[PDB]
Every structure is written in C-alpha cells, then in structure tokens.
Design a protein around this ligand. Structure first.
Ligand SMILES: CCCCCCCCCCCCCCCCCC(=O)OC[C@H](COP(=O)(O)OCCN)OC(=O)CCCCCCCCCCCCCCCCC
Ligand SMILES: CCCCCCCCCCCCCCCCCC(=O)OC[C@H](COP(=O)(O)OCCN)OC(=O)CCCCCCCCCCCCCCCCC
Lengths: 569, 569
C-alpha cells in the first residue's frame, strides 16, 4: 500500500543516501573480488614468474578491510535512521494513548498495549529498512555480475541467459507434476489410516464377542496396505529429484559443447571461464532474495496500519463550557443509569443520590453490586448513558475535563507512585507552584514524616519502582499526604481493605479522619468503624438505591442494611 | 542406546547392505566430477586442444545418469527395509493393545493412541535410517574429498588441514566474545522497557492528578534512551561479521602467499588450484551434516522407547482357568464396592443385587451416576475394588475371561459395526460354526429382514463405515440380531434410546420384547414402558440401593420411585 509514513522519515534523509552510497560499494567490492580469479588462475599459477601471488594477498585483504568498513558504515547510517523514526513514532503513540477514554485501556490490557510501542513499532523499521538494503545491495550485485559476465565473454555469457529461463521452466513443470502426484496418492493413504481408526474405537466389541484372532488378521491386511502405499509415495519423491539435476546437467552439457566451435570460442583460457561460471552461481543468491522484497515490505508496512489505527482513534469527549475554580457546593445524582462498554446487562439502573456540602455519605454494596462504579462517573472516567449528574448546581458535561478532575482526589489503597522523588510524588504535576516547605507541612499533617525521615536522602529519595520499594501500608499514607496538599474539595475515599496491622493502620485511620473535616466525602465503606459516623448511610441494592437513611433509621427496618450489618458480624 | 530394535531388522540385512554399496558409489560420483575440473581448466579450455570439450559433456551426462540410478536404488532399497520394520512393529502394537485392560483405553488415550501406530512408529525408521544415510554417504564423501585433495597436491592440501583449526577456534572465540556482550547489553533494554511499562499502568493517576505534560516530557527521556541503547546492540553485532570475515580471509591470503615461495613448496598448474580449492568448499556441507548424527539417532531411538513402554506393559488379568459352557444360574451381587481408576471418590459403594433365573431387573437411577457402572462389572471390563460378584454359584475370578465374556451380550443404542459384509457383523468371530441359513433365520426373527433385503446384494454388502452405512435404528436392530444369533444366556440392555420414530421404534421394541423371553435381563432403564412390565425394580443413586420393589409395591412408598414417574410426568 501507499502510506503517510514518509513525512516522519523525510527529515532523516541524510542517513538513507549514505547507506546507499556506502552500500553499493559493499556490492561493487564483492564483484571486484571475483574478478581476481582471472589474473590468478590464468597467469598467476600456470606459468613462472610468481609475482601475481605476492601482488594478490595485498588486494584480497584490501578488498576485505574495505568490505568491513563499508559494512559497519552501512549498519550505523541505517540504524541511526531506523532508530530516529522508531523514536519519533513511539513518542506520538505515548502522546495520544495518555488522552483516550479510560474504557479503552481495559478491553486492551497494559501488556498487550505495550506490544504496540516496543514490538510492533520496530517492525515498521525492521522490515522496511530490511527491504531497502536488499533492493539496493542485492539489486546492485546483479547489475555488477551482469557487466562482469558480459565484459569478459559475451559469447558464453549470452548462452547463459537463453538456457537459464528454458532450464528454469523445465525444472518447474517437472517439479510440479511430481507435486500433484505425490499429493494425489497422499489422500489415498488417508483412506487407510482412517480404516485403522475404525477398529481401535470398538475395543469393547472386540473383547465381548470373542473376536481377538479375527481382528488381528485384519491388521495383517490393512497394515500391509499402508506400507505398500507408503512405499509408493517415496518412489514418487525419489524420482522427483534425479531428473531435475539431469535437466540441469544437460544445461552444463551444451555450454561446454557450445564452446568448442571456432567462432563462439576464440580462446576462453583458464580464467574467463572460472569468472563467468563462478559469477553464475554467485548471481543466484541475490535473485532468491530480491523476490521477497514485496513479501517483506508488506510485512513491515502492514504493521504500520495496526498502529496508525491507534494513532487516529477518537480521544475523550472534551465538550467544555466553563472553568470551575472550586466546587463550593454539592454533587447530586438525579436518575442516572449506564452500562460498561463491553458488557450487555445494565450495571447500575436509575439512581438518585446527593452529596451535601460539609457532609459525608457511605455506599455498601459489599456483595458486589457495583458499589465501586459510583466513583468513576463523578470523575468522568466512564461517561453516563442516561440521566444527569450535577456539581455545584450544573451538569458535569458542561465543564472542561481539566478543571473537573482538578476538584477531585481519589484516595484509595491502590495508588500508582511515579518513578521520581518523594518531593514530587507528594506534589505531583504542580511542583512549580508548591514549595518544599509546604510539602513538609503536608507530610507532617498526614503523619507520614516518620517513613520519609527514615529515607537516606530525606525528601529526594527515589520512591517509585526500581527505587526504595515502599510497602503497601506506606503507599496509602502518601496518598493522604498527596490529597491533603492539593486541597481538592471532593473526596471519594475507597477504604476497600480493612487491615488490622496496628500502629501502621492506626496512623492511616487517624490520618484519614483528619482529612474528613471539611471536604465533602464519599466512602465506599468496607470498615464498619467509619460507616456509623457518616451523616447519611446509603446502600446499593443491585442496580438501584432502595434503602436510604441514617444508621439507626435503616437498622430498625430490616431490609438488607440490617442483614449487611449481620454479614459484617 | 538400548537398541533392542535390531532383532526386528536382522531378517532384513539385504536392503541395508545394498543401500551402502549403492550409496558409496553415489558419494564417489560427486568426487569423480570435481576431478573433471583439472583436465578442463588446464588441458583444453586454454589451448588449441578442442577435444577435452568434445568427450567431456557426455561424461557429465554419464555420471549424472549414474548418480540418479544410484540414488534411486539407494532410496528404494532403504524404503523397503524402513517399511518392513515399521509394518512389523504396527502388528505387535496392534496385537498387545487389543488384550489389555479397558481402563487404559477410556481417557488416558482416545485419539492420541493412533499417533503411536501412525506417527511415533514412523518416526523410528525415519530418524534411524536418516542417521545411516547421513553417516555412510557423508562419511565416504569426506574420504573421497580427502583423498582427491591429497592426491592432486599434498603440499597445498596439508596447509589447509593444519591451517583450518587455527581459523575455526579463532572464529568461535571471536564470536563468543560478541555473543556474551550482546547478551550483557540485552538486559539494559529490559530494564528500560520495564521503566516505560511502569508509566502505562497508572493512567487513572495520570489523568485525575492533572499531569499530562510531565508524563510526556518524561517519555521524551525514557524513549531517547531506548534508541541509544538499541543502536548500541546493532553496533556491537555488525562488528562481529566484518571481523570473522577478515579472520577467514587472512587464511586465504596466507595460503596464496605460501604458494609464492618456490623452494620446494608448491608447483601447481591452475587446475590443481581449482580441484583442491573447490573440494574444501564442497567438504563443509558433509561436515556440518555429520555433526547432527547423534542428535538424530536419539530423536529416533528415544521415540522408540515410547513404543517399548506401551509394549511390554501389563495385559489384562487372565488369572483363573475354570470353564463355563452355559451360565444356567443367576448373577448374585453381594456387598460389592468399586471405584474407577484415575479417581478416588467412590462411584459405587456396597451394593447387593440379584438376577434370578428367568427374571429381569431395572436399574433406575436416571440422575446420571451409579446405574451405568452395574453393567461393566459382570463382563469384567473393570475389576472390583472389594467384595465379590458371583455367577452361577461361583465368583467371576475363577472362570476364564474368554469363557465369561462370551456368556453376556451388551445390547445398546451405540453399537460398533465392523467394516465387513452384513454376514460377519451378524456372526462375528464365529463364521465357521454358524451357517448362512441360521443367519437368515436370526435376521428374520429380529425383523431386520426388511432392511437387509433392501441392500443390493442382500447378505454380502459392506455394512460398516466406508460402505453402505446405516441409521442408528438399523444398527440397534443388527445388535439385537447378533445377540439373538449368539444365544448367550445373559442379557444387559442399555436402552438409553428415548427414540420416538414410529415404524422403526415399533420394530425395535417388538424385537427387544421377543429377545427377553429367556436370557435373564439387567435392563438399564430410561423409557417407562419396560419399567412397568418387569419382575423387580431397584433404584441406585451414588451407589446407594435405597428402594427395591415392584412397580406397584414401590409406588405406595414415595421414596424416589414415586418421584421417578414425576420426572417423566
Ligand atoms: C548502479 C550502481 C553502481 C554499480 C557499480 C557496479 C560496478 C561493477 C564493476 C565491475 C568491474 C569488473 C571488471 C574489473 C576489471 C578490473 C581490472 C582487471 O582486473 O583487469 C583484468 C584484465 C587485464 O588482465 P591483465 O592483468 O593484463 O592480465 C593479462 C590478461 N589481459 O582486463 C581486461 O582487459 C579484461 C580481459 C580482456 C578482455 C578482452 C575482450 C573485451 C570485450 C569487450 C566487450 C564489451 C561488451 C560488448 C557486448 C555488450 C552486450 C550488451
Ligand atoms: C602425504 C601423502 C603424499 C602422497 C604423494 C603421492 C604422489 C603425488 C604425485 C602428484 C603429481 C602431480 C599430480 C598429477 C596427477 C595426474 C593425474 C591424472 O592425470 O589424472 C588421473 C585420474 C583422472 O584421469 P582423467 O582426467 O579421467 O583422464 C582423462 C584423460 N587424460 O585421476 C583421478 O581420477 C584422481 C581422482 C580420484 C578420485 C578417487 C575417489 C575415490 C572415492 C572412494 C570413496 C569410497 C571409499 C570407501 C569409504 C568407506 C566408508 C565406510
């Protein structure tokens, strides 16, 4: 196909014309070495004055140091252009996949999606520059061995391109008739292999009816039939070869015969026949690799469509209306329902919920009724299907996504810590505005100063993976510190795991309670300590909220909240 | 190696000592053609003597016809010994896999067991004659090319055996140093790829925290390292080939330089330097192919152990030699427990069942476990764990296995039919004693005569697979016919048909009712009609005989027989 990949290659056009000037000389330095068999065999060995054997070693090494220097220059000027186009393309893939809908990463997976910037992204330059040092290198040793063949003796070298195709079609139509004959009788052997299978199945009938010496005298007759049939498809294959060498041997019985009549011989000497025939066997390695130049350019440039689909997919919906400085209000769900893209059954049906100002709510769908699903919608990770969610008395879809997610922080047990310093992972993405003094204040407020003080360099230790490898308990307290520093009004505390690792858990529990003073909170509760203190507990009954009320109004009525209370016990 | 396969080949020492006489002659025809280079390049392709090109083309034809005739005789005389030592192993394999316990056939191998007759029995004579063609052909091809190289010139052919290991060890130790550097530099790419991986995972954290530019200004540094550490791996691999080519070209330079010194060291004639310098080129294929001889003789004699394990295994327990002619008695189960091999959970605990003379029993329990297992034990398809099964006043172990299994007939919907004319399929394994008139009478009594007459030749049409073929009802009726003809005085109906095809089910039911006059019946029950008309009914579930009684006496007590009607109704 024709592709729009060239504009990325076009700036790096200085390495694609030095790997073609210093790569033709790698093919014109091999065609110039086969030509040294003429002065060697003709007038270097036969006669006396052995000066063409002291002159020649300096020329076979001189054409092998020039074949090395011209092969390391054609592999550094094609790996500098095949390494700067698989770098300005991987950057584009990791500048568009960081802005797609969250629903895309699921249904794809992190591992498989990393195979489109590491494996099927160098295949666009490992099988498109590998089909350019094969049509320029092995397409220049064919125009080098054709003007070396004709230069020496056009009489013998023009007979070798009139018998070359005639021999090459008599080898194919002879090798083809023994390929449908060895395939015709191949299916005949399938009618006896199955005939053996139709007697191993009825083993229980072989025994019960007393027939054991009768079923064995039938495998003395159907095993003797796939031997003779197996001995016929090897006699049709061992006749396939001797008579494509005899057809090619008659080719080397007319060239020798042809070069004995006076006009078409002249004097072809001892050289000028080991250079015209040795050139004709070195000419057949380029010709069996110049055929696979569109079967390799369609295997590299066909992998430039599986990643140009990703590069041209739809990004997130950025329908923005207004900038929200601070969400000094309440978040209201009003008859909202949606399903995950990928599943068919509805996940959460029509729901009406409200998060008042300066208050907190709880969601206990612990059986697995999508209680975690009311955390993605407020952040617009997954877009709603029907209904409306209003923040500060206005729909979420109005605001810009940049200014909406700014007013939200997801504190949870699973937090991805970047491979950076702890002074950055505490103030990630806004290290410019916030000073180092405030970062210490945030950490001390979170009561996470103990772990950071234990670090070697304090507020500069590499904290992410391939670093100091903090444990799971310490990761959470950094998230509290991170959320506290930015002062995001909304709060969607996960608290999924109710650990009992005291001291560490006491600090986490004490630290979390400090965060929930202002800053309207949603808690997807698994720990019963913080369920009862909430202003208004709510429970997700499958797809819709059914039971709503404080801790005691919902317990006097049985419903399922009370049973959920007994499930905890 | 164990090589106890040799006794099966010892009778065939007539192809193996012709494929070594007509193969040394094939190897000594690729050596007598390279010796046609010295007369050509020396004594008639560079002189007025235009006669060596007149008798030579016909000598190439007369040596390539000889090569073909000596290569086809060495492929027909070793495909005849590779055929009669595999055909005589696929008669001991299918002469021992037809008398072993049924449990071996059930699930340990169902369709893969034919790979031991078709694939792993041909992979023993296809990689043990391919490691003898490649050690007598290409082990004489390096004696021919070692004597031709020494005869033409012993001074230049001894500076190619003393000067070749120097080159080989140098190439190997130069390649090892660039192979363990390209592997030390390979792990840095992994350590960078994982660093790139550890930012694709936290996409939700990349979005919610607002940092979309830090993550793309960090990939500009993580991917700018990938190209610099990737092109290093190319620069450290494109230096290997240019150096190990120069090391090999230096040997060529030194060999040519050696011939310069005429102080009794070299006197060649320009054809001796093409017969000696081309044999060395043609002496490396038969040295690369001779290394992979013990890598093929153990890939074709280790797969011969998979056959010798299946062979020489434990056949069925033939203990006991008591003789029984006709079981004119009753089968009396008494406190028998049995479990399938390959599992530990009891499939059938202690049962006590009775099969009196001239009586029938229905083993209902249609839930799908326990009832089916109370038919294999009578025929000793599976041995019993504990307890005793008593037939005609004595245990089954005492009687000979041949004399027991002939006393029972398994009539079932799923019946195997052999690939023979209907004449044997009705009288299988006893076509001698039983006459054709008796077969016709049995077919008439079974009311299968309508279909058999509908066949072209009557009682001579191939009735199994790859033949006339039949519907399930006709197969069942043929099973009834052969059961009637054999006149075995025990009967075990499966009767899992549940068919409702009128005019076929009518005949099947009539024939079955005619069959159950004599021949005490153990009728597995799915259709209620046979359950009604019977002597005694027994219910088994999980090996628990729970309800025993007649159709009416067992209904007033609910239990499960009252529920059995509720299953249908
Ligand atoms: C596209 C990108 C770029 C690709 C670039 C590719 C470059 C490939 C270059 C290939 C070059 C091959 C030839 C190199 C020759 C180098 C010099 C050499 O070695 O000369 C040998 C020979 C002289 O031999 P000398 O040392 O004197 O010993 C006594 C024998 N005369 O020199 C001789 O004089 C030769 C032997 C005598 C020949 C006499 C007969 C000449 C007939 C000429 C016919 C011309 C063609 C006519 C037909 C054309 C049909 C199309
Ligand atoms: C350290 C030891 C030193 C020993 C030194 C001995 C003295 C050396 C003296 C050298 C003198 C200079 C060279 C002169 C050689 C002249 C030979 C000659 O003219 O050729 C004779 C003959 C071929 O003659 P042709 O070319 O057909 O004749 C045509 C008409 N003129 O020539 C040939 O046919 C040669 C090629 C023979 C190839 C034989 C191949 C046999 C292969 C057998 C393989 C099987 C063996 C068994 C293996 C069993 C394995 C299990």
């Amino acid at each position: 196909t024709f592709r729009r990949l060239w504009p990325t290659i076009a700036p790096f056009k200085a390495g694609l014309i030095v790997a073609g000037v210093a790569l033709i000389l790698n093919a014109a330095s091999d065609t110039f070495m086969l030509s040294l068999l003429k002065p060697l065999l003709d007038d270097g060995f036969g006669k006396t004055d052995r000066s063409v054997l002291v002159w020649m070693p300096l020329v076979v090494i001189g054409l092998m140091i020039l074949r090395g220097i011209t092969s390391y220059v054609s592999s550094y000027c094609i790996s500098w252009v095949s390494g700067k186009v698989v770098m300005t393309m991987r950057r584009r893939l990791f500048g568009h996949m960081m802005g797609m809908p969250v629903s895309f990463f699921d249904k794809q997976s992190t591992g498989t999606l990393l195979s489109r910037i590491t494996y099927d992204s160098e295949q666009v330059a490992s099988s498109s520059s590998g089909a350019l040092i094969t049509v320029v290198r092995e397409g220049a040793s064919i125009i080098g061995l054709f003007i070396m063949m004709f230069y020496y003796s056009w009489q013998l070298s023009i007979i070798l391109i009139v018998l070359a195709p005639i021999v090459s079609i008599a080898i194919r139509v002879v090798s083809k008739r023994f390929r449908n004959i060895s395939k015709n009788m191949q299916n005949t052997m399938g009618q006896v292999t199955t005939s053996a299978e139709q007697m191993l199945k009825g083993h229980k009938e072989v025994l019960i009816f007393g027939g054991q010496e009768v079923e064995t005298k039938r495998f003395d007759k159907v095993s003797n039939r796939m031997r003779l049939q197996g001995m016929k498809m090897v006699s049709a294959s061992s006749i396939s070869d001797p008579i494509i060498q005899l057809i090619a041997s008659l080719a080397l019985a007319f060239v020798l015969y042809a070069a004995s009549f006076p006009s078409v011989m002249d004097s072809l000497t001892a050289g000028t026949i080991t250079v015209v025939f040795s050139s004709m066997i070195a000419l057949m390695r380029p010709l069996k690799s110049l055929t696979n130049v569109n079967a390799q350019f369609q295997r590299g440039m066909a992998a430039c469509q599986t990643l140009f689909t990703i590069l041209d997919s739809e990004q997130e919906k950025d329908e923005g209306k207004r900038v929200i400085e601070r969400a000094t209000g309440d978040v209201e769900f009003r008859n909202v329902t949606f399903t995950y893209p990928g599943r068919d059954v509805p996940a959460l049906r029509n729901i009406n919920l409200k998060i008042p100002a300066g208050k907190t709510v709880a969601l206990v769908g612990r059986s697995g009724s999508g209680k975690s699903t009311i955390a993605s919608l407020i952040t617009r990770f997954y877009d709603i299907d029907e209904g409306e969610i209003l923040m500060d008395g206005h729909d979420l879809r109005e605001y810009t996504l940049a200014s909406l997610r700014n007013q939200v922080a997801l504190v949870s047990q699973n937090v991805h810590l970047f491979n950076d310093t702890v002074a950055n992972n505490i103030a990630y993405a806004r290290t410019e505005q916030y000073s180092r003094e405030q970062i210490e204040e945030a950490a001390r407020m979170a009561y996470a100063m103990d772990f950071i003080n234990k670090m070697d360099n304090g507020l500069d230790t590499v904290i992410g993976e391939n670093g100091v490898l903090l444990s799971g308990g310490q990761r959470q307290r950094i998230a509290i510190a991170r959320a506290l520093l930015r002062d995001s009004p909304i709060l969607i505390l996960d608290e999924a795991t109710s650990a009992l690792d005291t001291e560490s858990e006491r600090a986490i529990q004490a630290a979390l309670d400090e965060l929930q003073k202002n800053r309207t909170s949603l808690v997807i509760a698994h720990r019963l300590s913080t369920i009862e203190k909430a202003d208004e507990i709510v429970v997700v009954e499958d797809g819709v909220i059914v039971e709503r009320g404080t801790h005691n109004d919902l317990l006097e009525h049985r419903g399922v909240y009370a049973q959920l209370h007994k499930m905890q016990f």
